[PDB]
Amino acid sequence: RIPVIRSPLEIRDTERKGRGVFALEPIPAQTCIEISPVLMFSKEEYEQHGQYTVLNEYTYVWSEGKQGLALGLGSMFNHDRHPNVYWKKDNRNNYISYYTLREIKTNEELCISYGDHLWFEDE
Amino acid sequence: AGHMTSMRIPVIRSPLEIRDTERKGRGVFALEPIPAQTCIEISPVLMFSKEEYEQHGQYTVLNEYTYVWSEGKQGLALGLGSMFNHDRHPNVYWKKDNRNNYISYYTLREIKTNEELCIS
Ligand SMILES: [N+]
Ligand SMILES: [N+]
Ligand SMILES: [N+]
Ligand SMILES: [N+]
Ligand SMILES: [N+]
Ligand SMILES: [N+]
Ligand SMILES: [N+]
């Protein structure tokens, strides 16, 4: 249900800024760069406990107020005002797919929006 | 002396696939043979402090996936690290990088097309 993607990404990991996902080489617009399996938290367990951990930096809203943590690279993308990556949530398959929003140049950081949303590509 | 640290870690693109399994939920499977001692995955570790784990994290599904780390901390392997099933007869070993908060996973032997990769 989820194979290797094989995209020209690296993680950069600095004392200063922590971790981020960066382009090794130019990437075409609308290229799927990552498919991340999700670790799912129930609504109750995230409200009672999960939200008071560092999970609160990274998780995404899911259906019925459940909360998902993207494994793979998905939690590593930083947020920016001008993101170059967008994503789609798949409810049936419990993953999140990441796509380039435009052509990406070599050495650019791959960033997502600050904002979340709740709809699913399989709905 | 010195300066701040700065690392560039590639994303190892191994011939692996996640599949749902019969009993064990998701697991990791080989798509083609893999030599012995090939590094198949380098997972960044999301670190939980002793306190947030003891007070909150252990009460969540995190408890099913995290690795005991030093000083009462618990590490959740991002990447594919949390997707390996555990096994009696594992064909994968791992090691922690305590300096940088990664876990690396290596095949214990030749892996065959369709075999499940399992740790302990
Ligand atoms: N899957
Ligand atoms: N609260
Ligand atoms: N996010
Ligand atoms: N789009
Ligand atoms: N967004
Ligand atoms: N609890
Ligand atoms: N191990």
Q: Closest CB to B46: pick one of A13, A72, A75.
A: A75
Q: What is the resolution of this structure in A?
A: 2.0
Q: Which chain A residue has its CA at the smallest distance from B6's CA?
A: A14
> How far does the centroid of ligand 3 lie from the alpha carbon of residue A75, in Å?
7
- Ligand 1 contact, B39 CB (< 6 A): no
Tell me if B65 sits within 8 A of B76, measured CB to CB: yes
> How far does the centroid of ligand 4 lie from the alpha carbon of residue A113, in Å?
14
Paired residues of B9 in beta bridges:
A11
What DSSP state is assigned to residue B24?
A: T
Numbers of helices and strands, H then E, in chain B = 1, 10
Gap between the terminal Cα atoms of chain B? 41
Inter-CA distances, B33 with A17, B28, B44, Å? 38, 14, 25
Dist CA A38 CA A92 (whole Å): 11
Tell me if B95 sits within 8 A of B29, measured CB to CB: no
Question: In three state form, how does the secondary structure of chain A look?
Answer: CEECCCCCEEEEEECCCEEEEEECCCECCCCEEEEEEEEEECHHHHHHCHHHCHHHHCCEECHHHCEEEECECHHHCEECCCCCEEEEEECCCCEEEEEECCCECCCCEEEECCCCCCCECCC
Pocket of ligand 5 (CB under 6 A): A 113, 115, 117
The dihedral built from the CA positions of residue A67, B75, A16 and A12, taken in this order, carries a sign that is negative
Angle at B78 (CA atoms; ends B75, B79), nearest 5 degrees: 145
Dist CA B56 CA B30 (whole Å): 35
User: What is the distance of C-alpha A38 from the center of its chain?
Assistant: 10
Paired residues of A35 in beta bridges:
A97
The parent domain of residue A73 ranges over: 1-123
Pull the structure tokens for residue A79.
């947020």
Dist CA A111 CA B96 (whole Å): 28
Tell me if B30 sits within 8 A of B60, measured CB to CB: no
Q: Which amino acid is at A84?
A: N
- The total domain count for chain A is 1
Paired residues of A44 in beta bridges:
none
Experimental technique of record: X-ray
Per DSSP, which regions of chain B are E strands?
6-10, 16-21, 25-30, 39-48, 67-68, 74-77, 85-86, 92-97, 102-107, 116-119
Name residues 90-119 of chain B within 8 A of A (Cβ). 100
Tell me if A73 sits within 8 A of A110, measured CB to CB: no
Contact A37 B100 (CB under 8 A): no
Pocket of ligand 7 (CB under 6 A): B 93-94
Phi-psi region for residue A5, left (φ > 0), alpha (ψ -120 to 50) or beta?
alpha
The dihedral built from the CA positions of residue B21, B23, B28 and B31, taken in this order, carries a sign that is negative
Compute the residue count for chain A: 123
Dist CA B19 CA A102 (whole Å): 31
